[PDB]
Amino acid sequence: SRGPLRPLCQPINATLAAEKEACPVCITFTTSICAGYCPSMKRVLPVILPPMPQRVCTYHELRFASVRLPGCPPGVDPMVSFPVALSCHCGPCRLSSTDCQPLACD
Amino acid sequence: SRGPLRPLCQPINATLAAEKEACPVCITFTTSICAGYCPSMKRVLPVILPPMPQRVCTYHELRFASVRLPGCPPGVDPMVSFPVALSCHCGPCRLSSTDCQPLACD
Ligand SMILES: *[C@@H]1O[C@H](CO[C@H]2O[C@@H](C)[C@@H](O)[C@@H](O)[C@@H]2O)[C@@H](O[C@@H]2O[C@H](CO)[C@@H](O[C@@H]3O[C@H](CO)[C@@H](O)[C@H](O)[C@@H]3O)[C@H](O)[C@H]2NC(C)=O)[C@H](O)[C@H]1NC(C)=O
Ligand SMILES: *[C@@H]1O[C@H](CO[C@H]2O[C@@H](C)[C@@H](O)[C@@H](O)[C@@H]2O)[C@@H](O[C@@H]2O[C@H](CO)[C@@H](O[C@@H]3O[C@H](CO)[C@@H](O)[C@H](O)[C@@H]3O)[C@H](O)[C@H]2NC(C)=O)[C@H](O)[C@H]1NC(C)=O
């Protein structure tokens, strides 16, 4: 459709903020993630669409880490993990997490 | 010297606990790290020692992530990073960090 840059997919050092309903203080953190624009590349002759099955950029290589939402009541699970992406590409509509200074989250 | 297993070097999902002098609550977390026994392999004929220059297992591949020691005074830096190891080996005495349920740190 429009111009592709719009960065394009790549591991990118961003920030998110982990917190769970009824845990006291939430926690922010930094982890490289893979986000970028993958084109649903139409080719020379159309009509073969759909062009590309929601090819969102998903993790080629992934390591997890997690922290520990401090103060959680003695009945809830404080261990909160997240991706630590190493490289990435674009394949089918893949679910993973969200499916197809610093900060604050309270 | 003695038997080598004693696991041997490998990325290993362990836990550490980040906290800084005069920040209020400390934070624990989980991150794969590379720890293992590397032998200072003496060979068939000695006298060529030292055997191997303090070949501690250090990170072949490494990604950083960091969290945010919550509540830090408005004059201190809450961003605390750590390794997110992908693979590893053994080379010279390499400095990096420490040079040659969950938890609590307060
Ligand atoms: C280090 O941990 C990762 C997983 O991260 C976990 O870390 C713990 C502390 C906690 O925070 C938890 O929430 C995190 O997920 C281990 O990675 C495992 O990798 C295998 C395959 O290599 C996965 O198995 C497969 O999972 C898929 C789902 O996509 C299934 O469809 C398959 O059938 C199969 O089960 C497994 O899910 C991962 N583990 C977890 C808990 O997700 C890694 O192996 C571990 N290292 C060590 C040495 O323990
Ligand atoms: C994503 O971040 C890493 C570094 O992690 C940092 O993350 C920030 C948020 C913060 O927590 C900070 O404390 C963490 O360190 C970037 O990795 C950089 O990699 C380059 C080389 O590939 C490093 O440069 C070299 O560093 C060596 C030291 O061993 C020097 O001897 C060299 O001369 C050279 O300077 C650099 O140190 C790394 N950056 C930092 C801050 O350590 C990674 O590039 C980044 N990604 C993006 C897209 O920004």
B71–A contact, CB cutoff 8 A:
yes
Identify the H or E element spanning A62: strand A57-68
Q: How was this structure determined?
A: X-ray
What's the rounded Cα separation, in Å, for the pair B80 and B21? 13
Contact B30 A66 (CB under 8 A): yes
Resolution at which this structure was determined, Å: 3.2
Range of the domain at A31: 1-106
Strand ranges (E), chain B: 11-18, 27-34, 57-68, 79-90
Task: Tell me the ligand closest to B13's alpha carbon.
Answer: 1
| Number of CB atoms found within 10 A of residue A12's CB | 13
With the C-alpha atoms ordered B48, B49, B51, B56, is the resulting torsion angle positive or negative? Answer: negative
What's the rounded Cα separation, in Å, for the pair B76 and B59? 29
Residue B21 corresponds to which amino acid? Answer: E
What's the rounded Cα separation, in Å, for the pair A67 and B65? 11
Query: Is B94 exposed, middle or buried (CB count within 10 Å of its CB: 0-12, 13-18, 19+)?
Result: middle
Which residues in A lie closer than 8 A to residue B85 (C-beta atoms)?
63
| Number of CB atoms found within 10 A of residue A90's CB | 20
Per the CB < 8 A criterion, the answer to whether B30 and B65 are in contact is no
Q: Closest Cα partner for A25 from A78, A64, A66, A75? A: A78
What's the rounded Cα separation, in Å, for the pair B93 and B87? 18
What's the rounded Cα separation, in Å, for the pair A15 and A77? 22
Residue B9 corresponds to which amino acid? Answer: C
For chain B, the C-alpha Rg in angstroms (whole number) is 18
The number of distinct structural domains making up chain A is 1
Residue A29 corresponds to which amino acid? Answer: F
Instruction: Report the DSSP pairing between strands A79-90 and A57-68.
Output: antiparallel
What single DSSP character describes residue B47?
S
**Structure-token pair, residue A99:** 């499916």
**Structure-token pair, residue B57:** 């297992």
